[PDB]
Design a protein around this ligand. Structure first.
Ligand SMILES: [Mg+2]
Ligand SMILES: [Zn+2]
Lengths: 257, 179, 423, 140, 78, 53, 202, 252, 48, 106, 89, 29, 170
């Protein structure tokens, strides 16, 4: 669950190599780590010679413990580990926020959006259920917002392989269901306890996870999203960036001349 | 001895069922008969008789049973697609649009007969394309130079992750913090 | 059928022993009292589960096959005999293949076992048994302890509504003409001999070409069209609102008949469910009961009604049969109502309704007999066959003297036509 | 070598020869095979022996609980027929039995009305077919 | 044709296929194609007839009568 | 059926010989094949094998 | 070119049907199907390479002349970055084996054996799939091949050269080699017939 | 009598300890068992779980409790098989080998269900076949092979080194869904980590040993932090001679 | 006959009722009569 | 022993048993050649046509209506049963229900 | 054994009493006769007494069936030859 | 035919199912 | 000659009694050892104790007899006895006599400790305690030595473990 310590030890060795994105600073958000660390090119950063996890000298989970590696870290490895940690505890944190079955008060605006999209709330319940229920692996299932088709389809349900974050696809996470096999197992042995097929119990975990959701949190999330894609600095940044990409196409095309 | 256990009425029934969909007929036995598994033809005949004794007429009972089969199949292949998605963004599985890149390679190799050297070179420059490769590449027509949109790459897959901002933090939504 | 306290006598035939084996007390506690007190039928499945016999078969004309199989056999040495007999048994009578628990015929199917053991198990009298039963009938439909089960539907006579109409139709006189053409046409058809049709063709020129047409064709088209419109009137009118008085008799030992005035609108399934909802409202049951409606025919037959379009036909076909002295505002119909589910309270009501329906002396007697054969209940204390036949004999011999058995109970089970001939 | 032909017939020429794994029918086949080798029986006689051998009471009516048109699956037949030739000492080199029994079937698979045979030419009789046209023969 | 295609970047299109609209559509599609085909391999004759008919076609509630009605009409059955 | 067979023999023929317009010196065919098979023969490109041309 | 006749389709034999989910009329200007099937891949390959078709995988490796599986495996390991090095060659082999027949290799025979015995017995009534597997796996055996050779031999399928080859394969034995290879009751037949067996089977 | 006694029950001697109540409850459980057996006979598909060569009525010695292993066998694996059967019927893959399902479904997203289930079925199988209850000592020839590669100037250094590299590989797969194999590439040994829904046959390697690194495998016994202990125990219980004869068959 | 196990259960059918085969009320404990071997070497020969 | 149709000594068929396509092709099947195989599917159970005259001498020809017009006053309907010369067809060429032959010659 | 049961060492094996009085019947059925050719009464093909029989009368029309070399023979190409003839004229 | 085979059916009894109501409900004609 | 050879052999080598499926080896419809399914089941399992290989690991190279004179000080026990019992336990695999079990217990205690140190609670451990009279290792649950078997016939065991090349026979 909490990786805050292992990442507390790992991060200072990551931050000088991340200064491209931003330099050393007090507070870092798991989201921005996940995205900064997300896709790693074999070409730019390879495994440095005598990579201790390449020859299987040290395990990837224990590279946090030895300090020899912390002095001269192998970028792709350190990255992969940090990405994993940040992503997974992003998941647990997020679930502890959506997983409050406390208030049974259900917002009007949420319904207003959901019926336009799905046609009822039961439709969404069922979407989440069959997406969490039927999985190629035991991961997390996400309900997220995508700005791309957002006029048409505000929301969609992506079940992500293992702990991988949706932020990695440029999707705005709204809510999450935990189907990881720890949950399945403790569910199984919660059933033999008291005062059976896997399919039906993992669907029971799916639809007893859906009933424990806090929709207000999703309201705030969705509003934050819409507000964000509505922001000026978004458009401006896009423009400046694509401008850079054009300058680069031009200068790389001039280089061969 | 060979004499059909099937009475003419049954024959007409499962023959009609079979001709209205080939899937139903083939399901149990495509190649050889798998005889320790139940078969759709049979299950459907069963629930057909079931419908008849609840007073449903011939036509509607048939189309109802067939709808049952088709809806079950709909469930199955929805599941298949739902997992297909996950599996494609896992990175190691492939639909036809990438397979055409594999075939592309095999065909380029055959058409222009290649030395293993030329092959390795191909591999490393295709690795360069695959990773460092850029969208929006420019050709010089001179004065006038035009930029167009290329194939896929990993760097493109980065820039897609940052909302084409060029920055790792765009998410204002609440998340954990580290100090 | 081990009965006969219903004819006012104690059971005979030694099966008492089988019912008292410590095995039966293990598997189905209370079943022994159920079958000995209540005359009640046991079937193949029940005789198999109790381990009364090892062998069961579904094959047609088994006897022929046994014959022809033992024709092909050769020696008499008991090795040979053992194998031939054994192979016969294994290949047919033991159910190795093609057999399921759904398919074997069973009265005591597992909910029923639970009920029996709640009612009849370990009770030291017939009296205790029925104040128990009386207390079970009293349960609401909503209690935890009132448990349901699949009821076996007692089969209808005719099996379908169409069969109902046809069966009803032999006591009636068909009209020469169907309802839509009886009424005279609005045009006038001059009746000719048949032959004058065939001489009615004619030669016209249409467009550029020569054509042979009937001179009367358009007239016949008007005619046939009008008849179709009358058919439409007739059918649309059979769908029109039908205000009839409804009698509904709940099938079971508890006589209850519900009567109410119902309007049938058979144009826009939902109407059948409306009628069933109403029936249940009157019977005092939840509206979620699975209810089989049925048509009680004037011919004393019975149908299921599966559909609204059928129900319309039932209303149209049966005019009703009514005692006019009793004044009903609308024509009656008579439905039978089958329950697809028995509750515990219901079942218990039935079984008490039978226990009250048979001779008390022989009830109490037969209880005494069962508990005398059973003895202690240990594997030793049960009487063997030789003592059981003797005991049953003792009781039978002592009861048969009483006027109850010979003067009354013997003629009890007679058919109806026998009683008619005697009367 | 004609033995393989006989066994081919018992395997492919008989609809529903019971379950051929069962020790009963299996022993029937074994004994008859050893009696076709060593010339103690005619092929025709041993075949009519095989199909008329005692199997199980009410055979057809148990056959209605498995088969539609009375044609069983041919795997049990070939596995048994190879087994018998192996357990009997029929060949010096073990594999040959199975190979030949298999091969002769595969070649006949392509023939028009492959698993039916004219009763006169099917086995030994006064008048015979020329060695090329004989049925499971090596010369086809 | 050796233009690198990454399977991760297709994901949007795959998600379009998890929607029950598109699967309703593949169901209709596959149920229309499931009737028994007598065509076998592509036939020139039938293609020609088909397209010639397409050239020719390019140049181009009431109560349902019940079984009882057709019971009463002897003529109609003839 | 014969049509199909002929279509796919002329296709693969066209690709074996069209490889030469793809690779002149490219190799891809064995050196010994360069020795033995590049000569005119009845299988390769005979003149005519029959009387009355 | 066109036939000598133009007819409609031959009627369909009783019991004969077009297999399920198989598009009978499909043309090359049809849109490419999404999945990977022998059908979809072969139509695809027709569009990509044109008319290049090979009977088996080693024929393809014949046409490319000196390009092994793994060399190409590096090209694909480059293109799809998240694949392994093993899965990259595997991808090649699977594509080639879809376009043509499956390869004949000791490796794949071993894999087959290993799965066959990793599954064990089955719940099939007569142990049906197991007799399937067993009867198949003996087709690839040495002894079976020897028998196939003796059978084609019986039909006079050899020539003089094959014979002199068999002869001088025999002369190479000693009385000792005979005593050892006659133990199997088969393998000496294989020592003599080796080249001829290899000739028929390949 | 074996046929008549239900699947779970053990057939033993009467000690006459049974009060009539529980004695009846038992018969009722048996009746239910007969019913569910009748429906499982018809639910049966083409593929099925493998018969275990060793008794698991108690745990697997030094490795698993009864509940752990039977949560693998009778829970996850049998689900995998139900899935596999659901999706290999009504498809071109009906009634073929486990291989020709694994191999013809390789690397395609459309058939990902079939492929995942298939490969998991294989992995579980090979895992069961890779466990010998009291363990075994690695045979000389295999030790000679391994030593020529992993061994650095030490006696059977290859054994400690192989059971080290396996640990490292296991700890370096973070997702905890998948398998660790010791395999033969055909030119050399190595320890590969397969993700869930992937298999050594799909990548055309030849498997020697399997280790199950799913969290569901070690959770009930070793907890969430107990992976190291888990692997260490696995080697107490593994089966070497199998790996050896597979290796030697691969070579020739 | 003897090799096929089938039908050997039938020598012992008296076992089908446990409390009886202890009690010995019925004299028939065996396939052909009073016991399994009354006359093994005599009876069967009465078939031609 | 003779079959009725052409006197064959066997009953005509193509395939019989469920296994034969499998067992014949078995090595291909273990290999996995046979996965998408449409030859082992299409023709697997395919049997011969029924080549038989359901009417050896047609009692079916003509259909009922025609009889009405087989009288003397329908030259057309006479003509559909004759040759182009007006002669009748021999029985084994164009078989007719005996009623039709009587009515026709009359 | 090494050959047919209906044929012994000296010829066809003589079952009925007609064979013992008339044993020319065993060794000679005509001028297409060889010794392996006894018991197979039909002789090779393209050979004397090679013709198969149908209800006793021999089948001498085979080519006429498939429409090779018959007067009624099937013609492959007509439209072509007619077209070309038209062109010439 | 006035003589009948072992495995051949004998003549049908003419009628000229309603009367099977007591039998197996599924039992056909 | 061959046929009556075969008859004698098949008659003498036939099994009898009831098998694991509760039936005769010759029973009609139901079969044992289908396709050498038991043969393979022995192939992959093999017959060996865990205790056996722990011992053969710790002893290593050095002389068995030397070890026996060591593990007995003068007054401990007859050397012939534990020599006998050791031989009969290692090859000809048997349950070890409580003599040999006591000796091995105080000899191997650290290897058994190390083999036992990681195990979860509900899983089989490895223990030598003879508190119960009998030696049959079907009696302890197979947990006394490392045995997976109730019984293995001596000859087969000896052949199997000698197919492992550890000891010097030649
Ligand atoms: Mg002549
Ligand atoms: Zn690294």
């Amino acid at each position: 669950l909490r990786n805050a310590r292992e990442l507390h030890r790992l991060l200072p060795a990551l931050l000088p190599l991340l200064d491209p994105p931003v330099p050393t600073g007090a507070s870092v958000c798991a989201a921005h780590l996940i995205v900064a660390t997300g896709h790693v090119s074999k070409q730019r950063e390879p495994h440095m010679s005598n990579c201790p996890v390449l020859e299987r000298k040290i395990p990837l989970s224990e590279i946090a413990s030895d300090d020899n590696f912390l002095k001269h870290p192998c970028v792709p490895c350190l990255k992969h580990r940090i990405n994993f940690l940040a992503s997974e505890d992003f998941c647990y944190d997020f679930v502890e926020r959506c997983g409050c079955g406390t208030d049974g008060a259900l917002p009007p605006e949420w319904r207003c959006i959901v019926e336009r999209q799905f046609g009822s709330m039961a439709a969404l319940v069922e979407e989440l259920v069959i997406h969490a229920s039927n999985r190629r692996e035991a991961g997390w299932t996400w309900l997220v917002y995508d700005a791309q088709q957002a006029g048409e389809r505000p929301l969609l349900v992506v079940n992500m392989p293992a702990q991988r974050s949706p932020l990695l696809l440029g999707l705005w996470p709204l809510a999450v269901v935990n189907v990881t096999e720890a949950v399945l197992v403790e569910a199984v042995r919660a059933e033999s306890s008291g005062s059976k097929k896997l399919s039906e119990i993992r669907e029971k975990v799916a639809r007893d996870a859906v009933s424990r959701m806090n929709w207000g949190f999703i309201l705030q999330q969705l509003k934050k999203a819409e507000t964000y894609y509505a922001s000026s600095d978004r458009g401006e940044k896009i423009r400046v960036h694509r401008m850079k990409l054009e300058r680069e196409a031009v200068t790389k095309a001039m280089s061969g001349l | 001895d060979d004499t059909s256990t099937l009475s003419p009425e049954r024959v007409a029934l499962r023959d009609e069922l079979a001709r209205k969909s080939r899937l139903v007929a083939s399901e149990g036995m495509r190649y050889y008969n798998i005889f320790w598994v139940r078969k759709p033809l049979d299950t459907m005949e069963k629930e057909y008789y079931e419908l008849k004794r609840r007073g449903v007429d011939h036509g509607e009972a048939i189309r109802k049973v067939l709808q049952g089969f088709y809806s079950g199949l709909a469930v199955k292949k929805r599941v298949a697609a739902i997992q297909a998605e996950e599996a494609k963004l896992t990175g190691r599985f492939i639909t036809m649009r990438e397979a055409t890149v594999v075939l592309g390679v095999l065909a380029k190799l055959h058409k222009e007969q290649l030395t293993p050297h030329q092959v390795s070179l191909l591999a490393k420059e295709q690795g360069e394309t695959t990773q460092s490769g850029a969208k929006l590449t420019a050709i010089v027509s001179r004065q006038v130079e035009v930029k167009e949109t290329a194939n896929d790459s990993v760097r493109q897959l980065r820039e897609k992750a940052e909302d084409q901002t060029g920055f790792p933090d765009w998410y204002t939504g609440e998340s954990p913090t580290y100090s | 059928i081990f009965d006969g306290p219903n004819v006012g006598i104690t059971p005979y035939g030694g099966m008492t022993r089988l019912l008292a084996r410590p095995e039966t007390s293990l598997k189905y506690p209370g079943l022994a009292e159920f079958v000995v007190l209540t005359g009640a039928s046991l079937f193949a499945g029940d005789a198999l589960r109790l381990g009364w016999t090892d062998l069961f078969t579904t094959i047609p004309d088994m006897t022929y096959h046994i014959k022809e199989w033992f024709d092909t056999t050769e020696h008499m040495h008991n090795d040979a005999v053992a194998w031939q007999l054994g192979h016969l048994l294994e290949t047919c009578f033991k159910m190795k293949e093609s057999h399921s628990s759904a398919m074997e015929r069973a009265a005591i199917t597992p909910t029923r076992a639970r009920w029996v053991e709640d009612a009849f198990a370990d009770q030291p009298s017939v009296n205790d048994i029925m104040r128990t039963l009386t207390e079970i009938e009293q349960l609401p439909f909503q209690s935890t302890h009132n448990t349901s089960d699949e009821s076996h539907i007692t089969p209808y006579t005719l099996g379908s509504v169409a069969a109902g109409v046809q069966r009803l139709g032999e006591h009636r006189l068909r009209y020469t003409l169907s309802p839509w053409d009886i009424t005279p046409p609005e045009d006038s058809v001059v009746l000719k001999h048949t032959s004058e049709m065939f001489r009615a063709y004619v030669l016209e020129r249409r467009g550029a070409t020569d054509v042979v047409t009937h001179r009367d064709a358009e007239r016949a088209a008007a005619w046939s069209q009008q008849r179709q419109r009358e058919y439409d009137a007739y059918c649309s009118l059979k769908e029109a609102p039908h205000p009839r008085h409804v009698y509904a008799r709940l099938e079971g030992c508890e006589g209850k008949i519900v009567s109410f005035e119902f309007v049938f609108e058979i144009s826009c399934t939902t109407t059948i469910s409306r009628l069933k909802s109403r029936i249940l409202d009157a019977l005092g049951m939840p509206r979620d009961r699975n209810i089989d409606l049925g048509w009680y025919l004037p011919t004393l037959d019975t149908c299921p009604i599966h559909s609204d379009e059928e129900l319309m036909q039932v209303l149209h076909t049966d005019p009703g049969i009514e005692d006019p002295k009793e004044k009903l505002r609308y024509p009656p119909i008579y439905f039978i109502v089958k329950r697809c589910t028995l509750y515990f309270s219901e079942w218990a009501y039935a079984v008490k309704h039978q226990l009250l329906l048979q001779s008390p002396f022989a009830l109490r007697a037969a209880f005494g007999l069962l508990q005398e054969v059973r003895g202690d209940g240990a594997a030793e204390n049960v009487m063997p066959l030789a003592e059981t036949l003797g005991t049953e004999f003792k009781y039978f011999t002592r009861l048969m003297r009483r006027p109850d058995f010979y003067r009354v109970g013997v003629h009890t089970d007679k058919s109806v036509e026998k009683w008619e001939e005697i009367k | 070598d004609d033995m393989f032909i006989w066994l081919c017939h018992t395997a492919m020429s008989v609809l529903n020869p019971g379950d051929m794994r069962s020790r009963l029918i299996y022993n029937h086949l074994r004994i008859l095979a050893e009696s076709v080798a060593s010339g103690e029986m005619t092929q025709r006689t041993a075949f009519r022996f095989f199909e008329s051998a005692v199997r199980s009471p009410a055979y057809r009516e148990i056959a209605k609980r498995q088969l539609e048109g009375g044609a069983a699956t041919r795997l049990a037949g070939i596995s048994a027929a190879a087994d018998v030739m192996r357990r009997m000492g029929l060949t010096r080199r073990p594999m040959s039995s199975y190979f030949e029994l298999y091969q002769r079937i595969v070649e006949r698979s392509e023939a028009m009305t492959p698993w039916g045979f004219p009763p006169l030419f099917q086995f030994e009789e006064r008048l015979s077919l020329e060695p090329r046209l004989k049925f499971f023969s090596r010369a086809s | 044709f050796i233009s690198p295609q990454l399977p991760q970047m297709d994901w949007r299109n795959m998600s379009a296929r998890s929607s029950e609209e598109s699967i309703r559509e593949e169901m209709r599609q596959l149920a229309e194609n499931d009737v028994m085909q007598h065509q076998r391999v592509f036939n020139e004759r039938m293609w020609y007839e088909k397209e010639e008919e397409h050239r020719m076609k390019a140049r181009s509630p009431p109560r349902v009568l019940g079984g009882d009605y057709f019971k009463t009409r002897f003529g109609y059955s003839l | 059926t014969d049509r199909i067979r002929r279509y796919f023999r002329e296709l693969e023929a066209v690709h074996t010989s069209g490889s030469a317009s793809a690779r002149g010196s490219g190799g891809g065919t064995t050196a010994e094949h360069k020795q033995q098979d590049q000569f005119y023969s009845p299988e390769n490109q005979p003149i005519s094998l029959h009387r009355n041309n | 070119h066109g036939n000598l006749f133009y007819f409609r389709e031959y009627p369909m034999y009783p019991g004969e049907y077009v297999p399920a989910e198989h598009n009978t009329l499909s043309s090359l200007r049809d849109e490419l199907r999404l999945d990977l099937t022998a059908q979809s891949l072969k139509e695809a390959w027709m569009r990509v390479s044109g008319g290049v078709y090979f009977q088996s995988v080693d024929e393809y490796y014949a046409s490319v002349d000196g390009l092994d599986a793994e060399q190409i495996g590096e090209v694909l390991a480059a293109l799809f970055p998240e694949l392994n090095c093993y899965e990259a060659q595997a991808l090649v082999q699977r594509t080639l084996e879809c376009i043509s027949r499956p390869v004949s290799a000791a490796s794949r025979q071993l894999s087959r054996t290993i799965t066959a015995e990793a599954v064990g017995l089955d719940n099939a009534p007569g142990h049906y799939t197991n007799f399937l597997e067993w009867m198949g796996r003996l087709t690839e055996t040495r002894a079976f091949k020897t028998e196939h050779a003796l059978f084609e031999f019986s039909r006079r399928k050899f020539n003089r050269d094959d014979v002199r080859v068999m002869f001088e394969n025999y002369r190479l034995m000693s009385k000792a080699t005979l005593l050892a290879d006659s133990a199997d009751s088969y393998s000496h037949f294989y020592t003599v017939l080796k080249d001829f067996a290899r000739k028929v089977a390949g | 009598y074996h046929a008549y006694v239900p699947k779970g029950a053990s057939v033993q001697m009467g000690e006459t300890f049974m009060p009539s109540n529980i004695a009846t409850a038992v018969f009722r459980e048996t009746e239910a068992a007969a019913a569910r057996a009748d429906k499982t006979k018809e639910e049966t598909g083409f593929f099925s779980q493998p018969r275990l060569n060793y008794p698991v009525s108690s745990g697997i010695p030094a490795l698993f409790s009864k509940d752990q292993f039977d949560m693998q066998y009778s829970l996850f694996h049998r689900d995998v098989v139900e899935t596999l059967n659901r999706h290999t019927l009504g498809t071109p893959l009906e009634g073929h080998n486990l291989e020709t399902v694994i191999r013809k479904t390789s690397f395609d997203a459309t058939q990902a269900v079939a492929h995942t289930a298939a490969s998991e079925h294989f992995n579980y199988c090979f895992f069961y076949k890779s466990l010998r209850p009291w363990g075994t000592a690695p045979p000389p020839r295999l030790r000679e092979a391994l030593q020529l590669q992993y061994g650095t100037n030490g006696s059977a250094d290859a054994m400690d080194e192989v059971r080290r590299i396996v640990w490292v590989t296991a700890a370096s797969h973070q997702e905890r869904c998948g398998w660790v194999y010791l395999v033969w590439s055909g030119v050399h040994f190595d320890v590969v980590e397969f993700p869930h829904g992937s298999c050594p046959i799909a990548s055309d390697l030849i498997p020697l040993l399997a280790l199950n690194v799913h969290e569901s495998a070690y959770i009930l016994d070793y907890g969430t932090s107990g992976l190291k202990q888990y692997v260490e125990n696995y080697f107490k219980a593994c089966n070497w001679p199998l790996a050896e004869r597979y290796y030697l068959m691969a070579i020739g | 006959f003897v090799d096929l196990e089938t039908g050997t259960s039938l020598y012992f059918r008296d076992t089908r009722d446990s409390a009886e085969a202890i009690a010995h009320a019925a004299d028939s404990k065996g396939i052909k009569g009073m016991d399994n071997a009354i006359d093994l070497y005599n009876e069967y020969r009465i078939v031609p | 022993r003779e079959g009725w149709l052409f006197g064959q000594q066997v009953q005509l068929h193509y395939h019989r048993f469920p296994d034969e396509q499998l067992i014949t092709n078995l090595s291909r099947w273990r290999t996995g050649e046979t996965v998408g195989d449409i030859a082992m599917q299409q023709f697997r159970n395919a049997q011969p046509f029924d080549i038989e005259d359901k009417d050896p001498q047609g009692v079916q020809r003509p259909s009922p209506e025609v009889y009405m017009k087989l009288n003397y006053k329908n030259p057309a309907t006479i003509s559909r049963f004759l040759t182009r010369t007006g002669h009748m067809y021999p029985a084994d060429i164009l078989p007719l229900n005996p009623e039709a032959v009587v009515k026709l010659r009359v | 054994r090494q050959h047919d049961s209906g044929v012994n060492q000296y010829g066809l094996k003589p079952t009925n009493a007609y064979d013992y009085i008339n044993p020319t019947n065993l060794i000679n059925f005509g001028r297409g006769t060889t010794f392996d050719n006894l018991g197979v009464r039909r002789a090779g093909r393209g050979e004397i007494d090679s013709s198969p029989s149908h209800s006793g009368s021999p089948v001498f029309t085979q080519a006429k069936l498939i429409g090779l070399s018959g007067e009624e023979q099937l013609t492959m190409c007509q439209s072509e030859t007619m077209a070309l003839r038209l062109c010439m004229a | 035919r006035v003589a009948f085979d072992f495995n051949d059916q004998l003549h049908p009894t003419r009628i000229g199912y309603a009367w099977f109501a007591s039998q197996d409900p599924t039992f056909g004609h | 000659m061959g046929e009556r050879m075969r008859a004698i052999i098949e008659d003498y080598s036939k099994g009898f009694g009831l098998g694991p499926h509760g039936h005769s080896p010759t029973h009609d419809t139901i079969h044992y050892n289908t396709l050498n399914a038991e043969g393979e089941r022995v192939r992959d399992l093999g017959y060996t104790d865990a205790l056996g290989r722990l011992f053969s690991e710790k002893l290593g190279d050095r002389d068995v007899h030397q070890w026996a004179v060591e593990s007995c000080a003068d007054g401990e026990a007859d050397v012939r006895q534990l020599l006998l019992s050791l031989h009969e336990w290692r090859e000809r695999g048997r349950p070890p006599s409580l003599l040999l079990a006591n000796v091995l217990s105080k000899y191997l205690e650290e290897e058994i400790a190390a083999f036992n140190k990681g195990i979860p609670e509900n899983a089989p451990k490895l223990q030598l305690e003879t508190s119960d009279g009998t030696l049959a290792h079907s009696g302890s649950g197979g947990s006394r030595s490392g045995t997976m078997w109730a019984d293995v016939d001596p000859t087969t065991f000896a052949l199997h473990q000698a197919s492992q090349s550890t000891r010097s026979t030649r």
